[PDB]
Amino acid sequence: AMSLKDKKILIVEDSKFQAKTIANILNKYGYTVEIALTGEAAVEKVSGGWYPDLILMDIELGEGMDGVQTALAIQQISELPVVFLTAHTEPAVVEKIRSVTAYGYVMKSATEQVLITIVEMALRLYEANVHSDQDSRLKAIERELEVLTNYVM
Amino acid sequence: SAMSLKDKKILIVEDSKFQAKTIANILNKYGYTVEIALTGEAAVEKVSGGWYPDLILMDIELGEGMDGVQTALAIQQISELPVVFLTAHTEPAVVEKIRSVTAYGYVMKSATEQVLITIVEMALRLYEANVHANEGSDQDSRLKAIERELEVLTNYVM
Amino acid sequence: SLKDKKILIVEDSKFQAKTIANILNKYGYTVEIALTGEAAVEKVSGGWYPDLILMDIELGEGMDGVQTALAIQQISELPVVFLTAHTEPAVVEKIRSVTAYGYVMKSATEQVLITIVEMALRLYEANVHANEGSDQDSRLKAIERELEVLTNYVMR
Numbered sequence: 001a002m003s004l005k006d007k008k009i010l011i012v013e014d015s016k017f018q019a020k021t022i023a024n025i026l027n028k029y030g031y032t033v034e035i036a037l038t039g040e041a042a043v044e045k046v047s048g049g050w051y052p053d054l055i056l057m058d059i060e061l062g063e064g065m066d067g068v069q070t071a072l073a074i075q076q077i078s079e080l081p082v083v084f085l086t087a088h089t090e091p092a093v094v095e096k097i098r099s100v101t102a103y104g105y106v107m108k109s110a111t112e113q114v115l116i117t118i119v120e121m122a123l124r125l126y127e128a129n130v131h132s133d134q135d136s137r138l139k140a141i142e143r144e145l146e147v148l149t150n151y152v153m
Numbered sequence: 154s155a156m157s158l159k160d161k162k163i164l165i166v167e168d169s170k171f172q173a174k175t176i177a178n179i180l181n182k183y184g185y186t187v188e189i190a191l192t193g194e195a196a197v198e199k200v201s202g203g204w205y206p207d208l209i210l211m212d213i214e215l216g217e218g219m220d221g222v223q224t225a226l227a228i229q230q231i232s233e234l235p236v237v238f239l240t241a242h243t244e245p246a247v248v249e250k251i252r253s254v255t256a257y258g259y260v261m262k263s264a265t266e267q268v269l270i271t272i273v274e275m276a277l278r279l280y281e282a283n284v285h286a287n288e289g290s291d292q293d294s295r296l297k298a299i300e301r302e303l304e305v306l307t308n309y310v311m
Numbered sequence: 312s313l314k315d316k317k318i319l320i321v322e323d324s325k326f327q328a329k330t331i332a333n334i335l336n337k338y339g340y341t342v343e344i345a346l347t348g349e350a351a352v353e354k355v356s357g358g359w360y361p362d363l364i365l366m367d368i369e370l371g372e373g374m375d376g377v378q379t380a381l382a383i384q385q386i387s388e389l390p391v392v393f394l395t396a397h398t399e400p401a402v403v404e405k406i407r408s409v410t411a412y413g414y415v416m417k418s419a420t421e422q423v424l425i426t427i428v429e430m431a432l433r434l435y436e437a438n439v440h441a442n443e444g445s446d447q448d449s450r451l452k453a454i455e456r457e458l459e460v461l462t463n464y465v466m467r
């Protein structure tokens with residue numbers, strides 16, 4: 001239900017309170033979580049060999065890199081799903097998000113259920129994209145079952 | 154074949170009787186079972202009474218009572234039913250509220266039949282994916298068991 | 312990887328169409344270009360169905376991308392992903408009204424475009440199989456249900 005997921009999540013949120021709260025919600029549904037208060041922080045953490053399974057990442061990070069610049073810097077050294085966190089959905093922000101990631105965004109106001117559900121869909125989408133025989137196998141099963149079923153008429 | 158009996162129930166939550174029936178008729182044509190609630194309050198009462206649709210199509214604006222966002226919150230405490238919002242337009246203020254109460258998106262009031270049915274179908278399989286995943290019930294883990302029993306079953310011939 | 316999936320690109324600019332076509336070729340998709348919506352409609356009518364259409368919201372002096380998408384919908388269930396420069400509300404509403412498969416920013420990174428193409432391609436295949444019954448989730452429950460009655464009979 002909210003069992004222990006092996007997935008590691010990196011939160012990139014300058015706001016200490018918003019960072020810690022999101023970490024809390026995820027922690028409580030089973031995710032291993034780390035925080036970075038800046039996009040630069042987050043790049044060092046990923047280039048220092050710690051590879052998350054997902055990045056929740058604010059489009060506003062403050063006076064350094066923003067979320068889009070960090071998403072690209074992260075892209076240079078990794079092929080990790082990035083899901084953006086945003087306060088609002090202005091066209092200028094949505095364009096920026098849809099142009100660096102294929103994995104969408106979550107409102108920082110979202111209910112808890114929404115956040116956790118977007119994170120699972122994102123992790124499952126990414127696994128799907130790293131990959132036929134599924135059809136063949138089923139076909140074998142499908143007639144081997146007919147093989148057997150007819151015997152015990 | 155896309156019109157076949159879907160074997161799925163849809164709850165339209167929509168105060169305009171004319172709009173609700175127009176959507177019910179498209180959903181029936183493609184083989185869905187349909188229920189209409191003219192208010193959010195009627196919708197909450199349907200589910201907390203024990204009736205569970207497979208998906209909700211929720212207008213974000215519902216007249217004098219709860220609006221669609223409120224309604225969606227109220228149902229989120231009773232079940233995790235997938236809720237797809239109906240909306241006239243895509244102003245950031247509206248899209249902001251929709252995306253904070255549902256992970257299943259929205260459909261334009263002006264969408265075509267095919268866009269409606271495909272969004273509904275897609276939302277239904279998304280939810281089935283998440284429920285299956287909440288339960289360890291991944292399609293490949295079923296494959297291991299089904300093949301393993303077919304071995305066992307096979308050996309049973311002397 | 313080398314996919315056996317063919318993508319039709321409907322784009323009035325030859326440079327942009329060829330830019331998109333190069334990227335897709337570099338990842339194993341068979342690609343074909345229509346410079347007008349009138350030509351895309353004739354390919355699908357003349358019986359060349361692609362696996363996905365990448366169509367610019369805005370084309371030439373003929374049909375725009377939305378009208379082209381609506382025509383294709385009269386004769387086919389093909390997945391259509393719009394190319395757009397700007398997600399302004401009026402534009403995003405037109406897009407959301409004629410396709411269930413979303414859009415891509417002209418300025419998207421190459422990884423984003425590619426990923427979106429794979430997702431819309433997978434999604435479309437699921438809907439086709441589900442609507443004709445041939446999806447993997449269903450066929451499992453068909454084997455599981457008959458394998459349950461088979462072994463429940465052996466269990467006696």
Ligand SMILES: [Ca+2]
Pocket residue numbers: 013014015058060061062
């Ligand atoms: Ca911030």
Ligand SMILES: [Ca+2]
Pocket residue numbers: 167168169212214215216
């Ligand atoms: Ca209304």
